[PDB]
Symmetry: D2
């Protein structure tokens, strides 16, 4: 994974994110309205919650939420990193359903009133640009001025490598490898050295170019090839998505969807959207909630 934060002008913030894996990971888009009651897990002692906000989920294998953006502009991305039970399939949605800002996610995660059941670490950004890194004891790191976030190593060891290369100068040398530190240093440098703009369509084009450079070429094997990329427009509530083999990039506009209590669940089958561009709201079909694995 490679997660980039682009802060344009006029409070415009775009969060890029690319999925790198040796095998294709079937991921579909699900739009959930408010008022839905979900369970934390299927084991004994699991708790429930009613979704306060509506959100769109990038559900991999139609079983677990890899990432998502809610109607408040809150974005949470899950990245690989080598008490009441809280499954990983609904952990991202539980924070999206109940919280509106990054600070609200930090307060709930600081309580740690849950257990979790090859692992992951998350990055949470709100519409205000406040971004943190959550890594498991739970450790919440404030990104501050950092813009990129990949897999390994941990965040303290990552910022050390970032500060080491920042003294060398990105204008002079950057690591061109596919390793997570190499992709993080490149993405962080480019995120600081691109022009800030107020146009939402241009900010996604700029964020796409940074994520493209930090992307692993497809079928790379001498095998974490980039499978797909996502870009969240936090100010305009647009969630972009594209498969690296498809011909068009499309977005789901939450401001044009019915997220009220009682609305039906919509689903975008990405396997049937190979040539779709522009807004993909009309291609959302009324479906049932995905079954947690």
């Amino acid at each position: 994974c490679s997660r980039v934060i682009y802060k344009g002008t006029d409070s415009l913030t775009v969060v890029g994110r690319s999925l790198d894996w040796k095998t294709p990971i079937p991921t579909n888009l699900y739009v959930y309205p408010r008022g839905m009651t979900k369970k934390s897990s299927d084991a004994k002692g699991a708790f429930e919650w009613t979704s306060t906000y509506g959100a769109v989920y990038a559900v991999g294998y139609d079983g677990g939420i890899t990432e998502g953006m809610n109607e408040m502009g809150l974005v949470i991305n899950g990245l690989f990193c080598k008490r009441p039970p809280m499954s990983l399939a609904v952990f991202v949605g539980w924070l999206l359903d109940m919280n509106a800002t990054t600070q609200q996610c930090v307060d709930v995660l600081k309580e740690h009133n849950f257990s979790i059941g090859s692992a992951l670490h998350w990055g949470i950004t709100d519409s205000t640009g406040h971004s943190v890194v959550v890594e498991f004891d739970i450790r919440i790191y404030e990104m501050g001025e950092y813009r990129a976030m990949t897999n390994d190593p941990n965040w303290p060891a990552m910022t050390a490598i970032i500060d080491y290369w920042d003294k060398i100068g990105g204008q002079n040398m950057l690591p061109g490898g596919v390793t997570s530190p190499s992709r993080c240093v490149r993405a962080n440098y480019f995120a600081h050295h691109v022009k800030p703009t107020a146009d939402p369509d241009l900010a996604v084009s700029i964020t796409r170019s940074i994520v493209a450079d930090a992307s692993v070429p497809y079928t790379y094997m001498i095998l974490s090839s980039t499978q797909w990329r996502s870009f969240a427009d936090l100010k305009n509530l647009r969630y972009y998505f594209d498969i690296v083999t498809d011909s068009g990039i499309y977005y789901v506009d939450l401001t044009r969807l019915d997220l009220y209590p009682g609305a039906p669940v919509l689903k975008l089958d990405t396997s049937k959207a190979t040539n779709l561009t522009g807004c993909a709201n009309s291609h959302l079909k009324r479906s049932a909630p995905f079954t947690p694995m």
Copy 2:
């Protein structure tokens, strides 16, 4: 700018190409049929030729052919080279050949890369800064680099090399590529936007991706290689932001094209067009088509030959 050659399986060759420049360069796609008589230049002593093969051109400013692909699978891409000097004292007088139709003259009259080598070796012309060097690849995968060293056409066989950027010249570029090859691309690669760095990365990844006989998958792989070698848009702090990218499918005769700010990538299929002599010239305005994907032969409208 980066030019990548992808050789899949079953004689499938895809030539990627990205245009990197500070300001946007208006580029439109033109489809020329056979039997068209064109002029090399407007100066005294220019010669004429009748196009033997139909080709699609990527004409910049609607005045000069940047790159193109003919109906035989021959692809020629023009890239900048700062130290290019086109004429000397022995080229003085040889018929003038403008850079606006230089790529088209090699595409209209030649079918293979070797035919382009035989014509360029004669060097019976002069060239009239658009200091550029070219990479020519035919459907069989044979690729060469053409550079002007003070009025001297220097042709190099790419052989196992897969990438081709700007400066320095090809011999010094091959040395930098071989130097980094011993270092190990899996261990370390240059991650800058300079021409050698982009050439070393795109050459390494072109060798370490899976070859395939799928024409669509081959294009998707070439896109990912060119995307990594592409300079991020609005890179501020010469050859700056990547403005557009093109991918030519040599076996299936498809010429892909996409603007980095556009939302879709489309292609022009030459096998589904009337390439007989006398056919109308077709133009694809890349400024009008913004959300177009798949085959772009639809939005091809009838236009007139572009004016050099």
Copy 3:
């Protein structure tokens, strides 16, 4: 500044170090015997201690102990660290310890690296020029001591062999671990910055042949330290290496050479009188521009250096 640890065979351990600075630092060697009463500082509340072990000190400006090696094989090396903060709110009121005699205090009373860790873990002193130390005993056990805002952070060097300046040891090991995954045989950072010098020295220390020859182990350590040594008259507005030191921990030999001198010499502590009442010896390095071999005959009787309290 760079610090390299070499572990050959038969418990042979050599600790190499190079001093990098813009201007030349006058450094003289002093040999102190046992039973010398010294003051931790000149301020109020300073304590005193009697030297348990005889040692050799590399005293810069003849007023402060940069590094040293006691007769037990314990070596302590002080290296600059920009982010070092010695005192905080919890250290105010503790007995003052001057940086001029801090290295000698640990070398006088302690014999192993663990004994220094226990003494530093108590932290019954306040320090009164930001540096961090590397301590190695005859057995090869080595640690890194850093003051993180009035907090003695002690890290086990473990399998790491090198130690330069900035950043701190956790961030430094993260850079070392990143480059180790690239492969030193494939690519190494060749700059004069502190992380680039540490990765090179740590790699080469692991990939040289271990030997039991005390003279070969020093020559091998010299080649690694010289590789991490900044060329002379080169500076950055991380400057030139002024001198290099090498300590043979098993044989109690302390090698020394100036980068501009034509020879390297060593002080053999086994061939010196360190009993209580022995005189303090001094070796003026400015007068040994062509001295090679054992330099015990050149040490002259001298009064103890005056610490710059």
Copy 4:
């Protein structure tokens, strides 16, 4: 192996040279006077010179009494003879140029004739004026390149491909990043960068110390191939320094204080006995016989 060129002020030029090999190479110093008739055709030595003779059978490098310095470095792709190419043995090829020539321009004129046939290696020649070139055999043809602004010289690849790598790393800026490996391009880039950024002086002793610090930074650690010995030639003062990496001292031979007239004896310095020698080693130059060429 690395060859560094240091130009101080007041026409002061020092050429450093380190020998890197997996096994130690016995190299002794031989001071040859003028008027000696040697065999390749034959020639009578015009100038006296000191020779770093490896295995006591071949001249590795050397400096003549005119300030001309020639260093020999290994090269993997060197082919000496072809179909177009008197036999000239490599054991005396360095001496023949040092005996009959005084300037770097004189060596280029003689080698350009190529009236002779020749361990593949290439050479770097520098005269007292600072003019330096690189001589390489490319499939029988002799290629002579002007070093000009370049200061370092190692092994492979050839000089054109080496200057491209140096120029490639020059754009990055040595103050930012340098290649830290032990490969020939990495060592040549580091030595060239530092040779442009050390303060040049008129002090001949400070020049050799600065030149040593550059060559020592470009030397491969011992037992890692491993650097065996380093040499430094002071062109203006006619001093040839020499030290073994495992020894404890660095000594030199001062040609200005030696008898090089026709009829003088051949002086040999056994480096296996000067383990603790520093300063001028002229007094330790014992009289001996000319070495036996391989």
